[PDB]
């Protein structure tokens, strides 16, 4: 009559969906939550000793630090091995570097002026800075809002993704434990939260994205209600990071444009323009094996340092390559959106993510799906303008044409196999491409 197999001090049966750690003394397994060990602490622990065993054997044996510049702080500090991203020395070095002020390129303006008419007329190809909050239609919680409040609304037991910035590695924590950590002024490690999307929490009630962002948003103007696919939520994000948190260079998923508002603290963006040259150097860099050892900002001609003060709102347009340094403990809200202003580049960025085989969960949920719905509606628009007297605006045409090129490419016999599952069973792929080709031919003719 063998006893049912249970583990941990809670004498519970094994659950494969829960993080556990092995005690080197008793050989049993323990739930991180039962013994107070976070998933990100596992890499620090050399040999784990559970509380009970610790009474006579002492605490766990931790790995010894010999670094300040390598992801694996155990490597000997002999001279070989370059400085890696997000480490203490890296940050020190990053803070000493000299960059061209982002003032040379970004546009600063009043919220009331930032409209779709303005964007269509002058384009949206450089970052836009909006010092004051007035006229953005951007509603956020009081500047006094604290992490304890984030916990109060969202929910203490919610599971979020944390980033051990000095290792550039991900793990998971409950929002409660993250707050406990953030609240302790003395943090033995730099942790950063950047993917806590709360549009489905009681905290959504408090935030309201910028009008321009909603006015432009693809999901907001083209994603149907009668959709079989699940509507994407990348509109409301809560960002919390302690000082010296770092995010290496990247291009937001799906070539989406984004908005950031620092409630309190100070974020520092390192902006790189989306030139063909740079976009190539980036795609190489983001795949090279020495990535973590090369500060990409050096592989290009100009890297702009944009300091975002608390109270300010920044807008980064499609394609821009950027890294972010957290000058000080900060909490900021932000969001991503796709729009017509730069249809071509968005597709360009999407094609690039596909080649870098960036993980599934690290992309934009249903990129192709939305692209279909858009092509569809734009067909009705371009057509309704023709049968109405006016000729479409240059950009929209340049864009619908790029989208046209894209849809045709996905249907291509040797390719339709992968882009197949992504088509909405609400659209006639071959049909849209035909009707779209003529309106394009028509427009191209009249002009
Ligand atoms: O949290 C940060 O310091 C930067 C986050 C960021 O740039 C992003 O999520 O795209
Ligand atoms: Fe970003
Ligand atoms: Zn033990
Ligand atoms: Zn347990």
Could you write a compact summary of the structure shown?
It is classed as h3k4me3 binding protein, transferase. With 447 residues, the protein is an alpha+beta fold. Helix content is 31%, strand content 20%.
SSE inventory with pairings:
Elements lengths: L19 E3 L6 E3 H4 L9 E3 L3 H7 L3 E2 L25 H9 L10 E2 L7 H7 L5 E3 L16 H8 L4 E6 L4 E6 H9 L7 E7 L13 H6 L1 H5 L14 E5 L4 E5 L6 E16 L3 H10 L18 E6 L3 E4 L4 E17 L5 H13 L11 H20 L7 H18 L4 H4 L9 H18 L1
Bound molecules: 2-oxoglutaric acid, fe (ii) ion and zinc ion (2 copies).
The site of one zinc ion has 7 residues, from helix 2.
Which CATH architecture of the largest domain? Sandwich
* Biggest sheet details: 11 strands, mixed
Estimated helix fraction = 25-40%
Residue share in β-strands? 15-25%
The secondary-structure element order is EEHEHEHEHEHEEHEHHEEEHEEEHHHHH
Question: What multimeric state do the chains show?
Answer: monomer
Compute the gyration radius: what is it?
25 Å
CATH-assigned homologous superfamily of the largest domain? Cupin
Structural class: alpha+beta
Secondary structure tally: strands: 15
Distance between the termini: 87 Å
CATH class of the largest domain: Mainly Beta
Bound molecules: 2-oxoglutaric acid, fe (ii) ion, zinc ion
Helix count equals 14
Spatial shape: globular
PDB class: h3k4me3 binding protein, transferase
Keywords: Metal-binding, transferase
Assembly: monomeric
Entry title: Structure of KIAA1718, human Jumonji demethylase, in complex with alpha-ketoglutarate
């Amino acid at each position: 009559p063998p006893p049912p197999p249970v583990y941990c001090v809670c004498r519970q049966p094994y659950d494969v969906n829960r993080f556990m750690i092995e005690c080197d003394i008793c050989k049993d397994w323990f739930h991180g939550s039962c013994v107070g060990v976070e998933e990100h602490h596992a890499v620090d622990i050399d040999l784990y000793h559970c509380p009970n065993c610790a009474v006579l054997h002492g605490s766990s044996l931790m790995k010894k630090r010999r670094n300040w510049h390598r992801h694996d702080y155990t490597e000997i500090d002999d001279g070989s091995k370059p400085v890696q991203a997000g480490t203490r020395t890296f940050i020190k070095e990053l803070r000493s570097r000299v960059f061209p002020s982002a003032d040379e390129i970004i546009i600063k303006m009043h919220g009331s002026q930032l409209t779709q008419r303005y964007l269509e007329k002058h384009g949206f190809d450089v970052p836009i800075m909006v010092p004051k909050l007035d006229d953005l239609g951007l509603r956020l919680p009081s500047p006094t809002f604290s992490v304890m409040d984030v916990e109060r609304y969202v929910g203490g037991d919610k599971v979020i993704d944390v980033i051990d910035v000095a290792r550039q590695a991900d793990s998971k924590m409950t929002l409660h434990n993250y707050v406990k950590y953030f609240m302790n002024p003395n943090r033995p490690k730099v942790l950063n939260v950047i993917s806590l999307e709360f549009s489905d929490t009681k905290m959504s009630e408090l935030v309201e994205v910028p009008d321009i962002a909603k006015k432009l948003s693809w999901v907001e103007n083209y994603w149907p209600d009668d959709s079989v696919f699940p509507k994407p939520f990348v509109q409301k994000y809560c960002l919390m990071g302690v000082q010296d948190s770092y995010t290496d260079f990247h291009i937001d998923f799906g070539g989406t444009s984004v908005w950031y508002h620092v409630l309190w603290g100070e974020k520092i963006f390192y902006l790189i323009k989306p030139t063909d040259e740079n976009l190539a150097r980036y795609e190489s860099w983001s795949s090279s094996v020495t990535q973590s050892e090369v500060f990409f900002g050096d592989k290009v001609d100009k890297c702009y340092k944009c300091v975002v003060k608390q109270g300010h709102t920044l807008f980064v347009p499609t394609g821009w390559i950027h890294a972010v340094l957290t000058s000080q403990d900060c909490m900021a809200f932000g969001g991503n959106f796709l729009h017509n202003l730069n249809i071509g580049m968005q597709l360009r960025c999407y094609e690039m993510e596909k080649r870098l085989k960036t993980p599934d969960l690290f992309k934009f949920p249903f990129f192709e799906a939305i692209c279909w719905f858009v092509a569809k509606n734009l067909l009705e628009t371009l057509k309704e303008l023709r049968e109405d007297g006016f000729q479409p605006q240059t950009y929209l045409v340049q864009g619908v044409k790029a989208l046209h090129t894209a849809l045709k490419l996905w249907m291509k016999k040797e390719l339709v196999s992968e882009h197949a599952f992504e088509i909405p069973d609400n659209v006639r792929p071959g049909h849209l491409i035909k009707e779209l080709s003529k309106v394009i031919r028509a427009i191209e003719e009249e002009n």
